[PDB]
Amino acid sequence: SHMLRPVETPTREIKKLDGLWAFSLDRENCGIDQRWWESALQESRAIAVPGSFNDQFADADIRNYAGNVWYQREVFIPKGWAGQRIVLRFDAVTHYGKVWVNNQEVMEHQGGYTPFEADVTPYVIAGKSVRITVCVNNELNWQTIPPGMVITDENGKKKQSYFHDFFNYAGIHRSVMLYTTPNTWVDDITVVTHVAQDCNHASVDWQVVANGDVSVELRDADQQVVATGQGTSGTLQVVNPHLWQPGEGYLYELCVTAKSQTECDIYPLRVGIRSVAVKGEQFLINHKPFYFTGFGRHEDADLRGKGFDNVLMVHDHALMDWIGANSYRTSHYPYAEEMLDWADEHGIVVIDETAAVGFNLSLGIGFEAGNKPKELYSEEAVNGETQQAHLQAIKELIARDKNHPSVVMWSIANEPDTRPQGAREYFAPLAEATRKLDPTRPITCVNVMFCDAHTDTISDLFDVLCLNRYYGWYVQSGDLETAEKVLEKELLAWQEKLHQPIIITEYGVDTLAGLHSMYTDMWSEEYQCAWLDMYHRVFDRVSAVVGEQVWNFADFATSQGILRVGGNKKGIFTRDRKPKSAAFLLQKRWTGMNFGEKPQQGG
Amino acid sequence: SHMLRPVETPTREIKKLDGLWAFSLDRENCGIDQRWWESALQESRAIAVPGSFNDQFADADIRNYAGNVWYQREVFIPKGWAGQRIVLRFDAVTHYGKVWVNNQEVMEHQGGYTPFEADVTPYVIAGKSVRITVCVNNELNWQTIPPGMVITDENGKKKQSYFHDFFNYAGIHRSVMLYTTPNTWVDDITVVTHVAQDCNHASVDWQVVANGDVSVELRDADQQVVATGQGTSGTLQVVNPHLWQPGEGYLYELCVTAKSQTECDIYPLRVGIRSVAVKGEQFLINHKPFYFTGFGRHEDADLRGKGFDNVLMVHDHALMDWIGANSYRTSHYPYAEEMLDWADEHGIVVIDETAAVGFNLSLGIGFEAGNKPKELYSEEAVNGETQQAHLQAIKELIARDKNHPSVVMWSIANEPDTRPQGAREYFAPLAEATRKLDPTRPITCVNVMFCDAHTDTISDLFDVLCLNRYYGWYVQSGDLETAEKVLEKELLAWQEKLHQPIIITEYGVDTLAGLHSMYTDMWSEEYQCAWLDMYHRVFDRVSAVVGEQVWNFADFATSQGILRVGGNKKGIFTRDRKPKSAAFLLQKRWTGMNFGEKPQQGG
Numbered sequence A, B: 001s002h003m004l005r006p007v008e009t010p011t012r013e014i015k016k017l018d019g020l021w022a023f024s025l026d027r028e029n030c031g032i033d034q035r036w037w038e039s040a041l042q043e044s045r046a047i048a049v050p051g052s053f054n055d056q057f058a059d060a061d062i063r064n065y066a067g068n069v070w071y072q073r074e075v076f077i078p079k080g081w082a083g084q085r086i087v088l089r090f091d092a093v094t095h096y097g098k099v100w101v102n103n104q105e106v107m108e109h110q111g112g113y114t115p116f117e118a119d120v121t122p123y124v125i126a127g128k129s130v131r132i133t134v135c136v137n138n139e140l141n142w143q144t145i146p147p148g149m150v151i152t153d154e155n156g157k158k159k160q161s162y163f164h165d166f167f168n169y170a171g172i173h174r175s176v177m178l179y180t181t182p183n184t185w186v187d188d189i190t191v192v193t194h195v196a197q198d199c200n201h202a203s204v205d206w207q208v209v210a211n212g213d214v215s216v217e218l219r220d221a222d223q224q225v226v227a228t229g230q231g232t233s234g235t236l237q238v239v240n241p242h243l244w245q246p247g248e249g250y251l252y253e254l255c256v257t258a259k260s261q262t263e264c265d266i267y268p269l270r271v272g273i274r275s276v277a278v279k280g281e282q283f284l285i286n287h288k289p290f291y292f293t294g295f296g297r298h299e300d301a302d303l304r305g306k307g308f309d310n311v312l313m314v315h316d317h318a319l320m321d322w323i324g325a326n327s328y329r330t331s332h333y334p335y336a337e338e339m340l341d342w343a344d345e346h347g348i349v350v351i352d353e354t355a356a357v358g359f360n361l362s363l364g365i366g367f368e369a370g371n372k373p374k375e376l377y378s379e380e381a382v383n384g385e386t387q388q389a390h391l392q393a394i395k396e397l398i399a400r401d402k403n404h405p406s407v408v409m410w411s412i413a414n415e416p417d418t419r420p421q422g423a424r425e426y427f428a429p430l431a432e433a434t435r436k437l438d439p440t441r442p443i444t445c446v447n448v449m450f451c452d453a454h455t456d457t458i459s460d461l462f463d464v465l466c467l468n469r470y471y472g473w474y475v476q477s478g479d480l481e482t483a484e485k486v487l488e489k490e491l492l493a494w495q496e497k498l499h500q501p502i503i504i505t506e507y508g509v510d511t512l513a514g515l516h517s518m519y520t521d522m523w524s525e526e527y528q529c530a531w532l533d534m535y536h537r538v539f540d541r542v543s544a545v546v547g548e549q550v551w552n553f554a555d556f557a558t559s560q561g562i563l564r565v566g567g568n569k570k571g572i573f574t575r576d577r578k579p580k581s582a583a584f585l586l587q588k589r590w591t592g593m594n595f596g597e598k599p600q601q602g603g
Ligand SMILES: COc1cccc(NC(=S)N(CCO)Cc2cc3cc(C)c(C)cc3[nH]c2=O)c1
Pocket: A162, A163, A164, A165, A362, A363, A364, A365, A449, A450, A468, A474, A475, A506, A559, A561, A563, A564, B366, B367
C-alpha cells in the first residue's frame, strides 16, 4: 500500500511512544484462544516503547524467548478530532504484529523494519479511552525476511536459530502513534529530480490522492514560492536551482494541497535536487566522481536493543561527522526513518538496505548438528513464497525511501550464497523488478568473500560492486603480508571481470579495547590499525575502488558462539561509544582527503 | 641412555644456567656451512637462559621465526675438577639441539622437553675457559613429537603450522650445567615400592653402575638408617613405614654407593613409599580410593615463554594449595623435573604426559581450505617412523620420571583422532611397550570429544579413561540445560562400555577477566562459574568419575586465529595469575570436600 511520513499541519499526533505499556509473555500460546486482548493482560509488568523487549529486564529467559509476547496500553483520543480520520501507525514491529482496539482487529504485519497503519475511526470515540493490544511475534522461518528456523523441542518450548550475526532483537522498536487526517487527504507522493551539467533543472511530481485537487508548490529554503504546478496527477517544474550536495545538503519544500469543497489537506515533502547513477567505473551524484567513506552500522546499543533513540542518534552522528564519514549503509535491515531525514538534512550519503540477510548456509562455523536443508533454493528452503515475501520487502523499503535524497542506492541483500543452483534464477527477477519500482537509483547486492571473482554467479545483474572482505582475518589469519596480495589480486580480478565501480561495504577485524601488543597481532588494538592501514594502501592502488565503509562503527550484540566474544568486537568504537585507537587512524585518512575525492594513488 | 638427576654429593655442579648468553637467528641458513661453533657468534645479542627465545625481545619477526638459532657462551672449568668425569648437561632444548665445545661436536638431541648429557672430559681442560655453541631448531614435521608441517611460500620463507593450541615457544627452556662424578659412578637407579593393607613393606631396587660394587641404605626423614642392602642390580628392602601419601608425601631417602678399589661414588635418591593401582572403577593410592582435583597446566608465562622459573613455581603452588587442588597433568609435554621434585615433597599427585599432542587433523579452525594429508595414519603423515619417534618419547619420559613417587600414571598422547582405521594399529604397540617400560603405573591416552563412546577405537587398550569434554561451549553453545543431558548420557556410556575409572582431564570455558553479565552467557565470568558448576553436578552423579582437572590453571599464549582471543582464555587465573571469580567457586568446592575423596552425591 501507500506510505507517507506523518508531519503535523491539517493532521496532528498523540505519540503513544509514551513509553510504559503493560507487557507479558505467552509461553503457552493460549493467548489468542483465551482472547487476552478483551481485558487487561494479567501477570504483566511495565516495559518501555520504543526499545527491544529482550534486554530491558536483565533476564536470560526473556532475552532468549521465542514466540508471542503481548503489549497493552490505554489512551484518550483527543476531543478536537471530531468526525475526522483517525489513523494508528507503527514505525516498526519487530517481525510481526496483530492489533486489537478494544475488541476490533485493526491490523496485521509481517516485516519488522517498516511502517504499517490503519483507519480506526469506527471503533474509536474522540474524547474517550481505548484499549490497545498488540501481539508480537519474533519467530523466523524460510519465507521470512531474514530467514531462519524454529526448532521446537520435545519438552514444550520453541528455540530460534537463524543465519546472521547480529542478535535477534524483537519488540516495538520504533514510535507508535495515533494520528489525524481530514476526509480529503494526500495519501501518496513521488518526486524525481533531473540534473543537467550543473546549470539548471527539473523535478517531476506524481501524487495519488484522497479525493481532491492538488496545488503543488515548491519553496525556497526561505519560504519563497519558486515553483508552482497544477494537476493532481503530474508535473515537471524547470527552475534554475540550488543542489543537494554531500558537504552541505540543501533542501526544498514542496507543499501538497488536496482540495474538496468542504476540506483542505496540506503536506510539506522535503526534496533534494540530486541525480544519481553510474557511468562506467565511476559513481555519480550530480554528475560527479564520488568517493564513499564511513561504515556499515547496526541499530544496537546497551539496554534498548535495536530500539530507536534520539540521544544515541545525535551522539553517533557527532561521532561520524568528527571522524570523516560521508556515508554509511543501513546494515542488514531498514533503519528508523529519522536517520534518513537526518542524512538528507545533513547531506549524508546512504546505501539503503533490506532485511534480506542470511540466505547463505555455508556461513558457517559449525561443530554442531548439521541440518540445515540440503538445497538453498527448494520448496524446503528458499522457495517461491520466499522470493515473493522477499519481493514485498523490497517494495516497502522503496515505498518508504524513494523520496529521501540521502539514499543514493538500493541494496537487495547482503552475503547470499550464489554457488548453489537456483542462485541466478532467484536473483534475476528481483533485480529487474527493483528498477521497475525505482529507476532513479542504482541497485546492488552485497557480496560474501567466498563467492569470489571466479565463482559468484550473480554480479552482472547489478549496477555497483559491493564487497565484504576479510583477508588477514578469516583466512590468512594474521598475515598482512600475503593478505595484501590476495586482496589486490582479487580486486583487480573483479575490475576486469565486470568493469563496474567497486565499494567495500565491509572491511574489519575483531579488536578488544585495551588489548595492546608489541607483536601487533590479532585482537590487539595495534593490529586493527595495521590491518586497516593495509586495506587502505591497496585501495589506493586500484582505480575501480570508489567506496570504503568500515565493518562496524561500534561493537554490537550477536547470537552466542565461539567466534563472538560477548558480541561482534569489530567496532571502531566500543558499544558505549568509546573509541578504539583505530578511530584516530580513520580520523586522519577521512578528514585528510578532499571531500568525495580518492587520493593521487598515494596522498 | 641412562638419566639420573644431578645432585651435589661426591658429585658437583657449576650451574652455568647463569643465563646471559650470546644469540642470533640464521635466516639464510648459513650456520652449519660456516662452522659458527668455531668462532664467537657475529651480530649477536644478549639473551636470557633459561627462557623461550620468542618473547624476550618484543619483536614479531623473532617470535614467529622458523629455522635455526644459535646460543653461545664462554665458561670456566673449575680448577678443582682434576681427575674428573666432566659432564655437560642440558635439562631441555626445545625441539632439537646440537652442541659444540670449541669445535668439538658433543651432542645432538630431538625432543624439546627432556634432558640430554655428554661425558666431555677429553674436550675440556680443568681451569681453562671454553666456548659452547648450541644450534637450536624449532621446526616440526610428521616424525617430530609433536608433529607439524612447515610450509614454505614461493619465496623460500618457512612458516610453521601445527595441530595443537599452545604456542610453539622454543629455545633453551631449562638449566644447562657442567657437573662432576668419579670414574666409578652410579648412572642408573630404579625403585619399586610395595605395600599391603598398610602396615609394613618393601622396596625392590635395581642399580646400574659404572665400574663398581654397590651398597644401599634407606635413611629416614630424621636421617636414621631404617634398612640396608648389598648387591648390584638387585635388592629388596623391607620396612615398617610411613607411606608417601597425597596429603603430605613422606619421604625416605635411598643412598647409593658405587665402590671401586680406589674411587668412590655416592648418590641420594628420594623415595616415597606408596602403591598406585586401578581396581575396577576406582583409582587406588595406598589401597584407598582417591579422587583427583586440580588442573591441566601449561608451561607459560609472560616474557619467558616456557622458560622455567623458580618464583613462578613457588607462586603457582601457593595458588593451587590455596584453591584446594590435589593434582595436575603435565598437559602436553614433560615438565621441568623441579616441578616433580616439588610434587614429591608436598604430596601432589601428577599425571605425567608425553609431548604427543596434535595427532589429529580434525581440530581445524575453519575455512583456510588447505591443506593437510587426507589420511592421518599414512606414510605421508603419521607413519612407522612417527611411531618410533613416539616410542622414543615415551622411553625418554619414563627414564626420567620413573622414581618420582608423585607420578601415579603415564599419559601417552592427548586427543589423537581415533576414528580412522589404523589408529588402533598405531597405538596398540605403544600401549604395550609403555607397560613393559614401567609395569608400576596405570597408563592412559587422553580422549578428544568427537571420538565419543560409540566411535572411539582405542580406549580398551588403556587403564584409565581420561576425557577432554566441552559440551556447552564448542557444541550446544551456551545451552547448559542440553549440554548437561549430553554430558551425563556420554559419561554413563563410557562407564558401561569400559568399566574403567574416569578422570575428566579437561573441562572449562573461555572467560575474559572482567566481562560480567546478567544473562550468564558465553564469555563472561558468570558463565564460567555456572558451566563448571553444571559439570560438577553431573560428576557427582556418576560413580565411575574419579577425578576432575579443570582445563586451564591460567590463560596461555596460542598461535593466532579467530577462536583464540590473544590466547586460550580457559584460565581460572589470568596469565599474570589474577583470579577470575571461578577461582573462588573451585576453592569452595575443593577445600570443602574431605581430602582425596569423592563427594556423597550432594552438597
Ligand atoms: C550464523 O550467524 C553467525 C554466527 C557467528 C558467526 C557468523 N559469521 C559471519 S556472518 N561471518 C561473515 C563475516 O562477514 C563470519 C564467517 C566468515 C566466513 C568466511 C569464509 C571464507 C568461510 C568459508 C566461512 C565463514 N564463516 C563465518 O561464519 C555468523
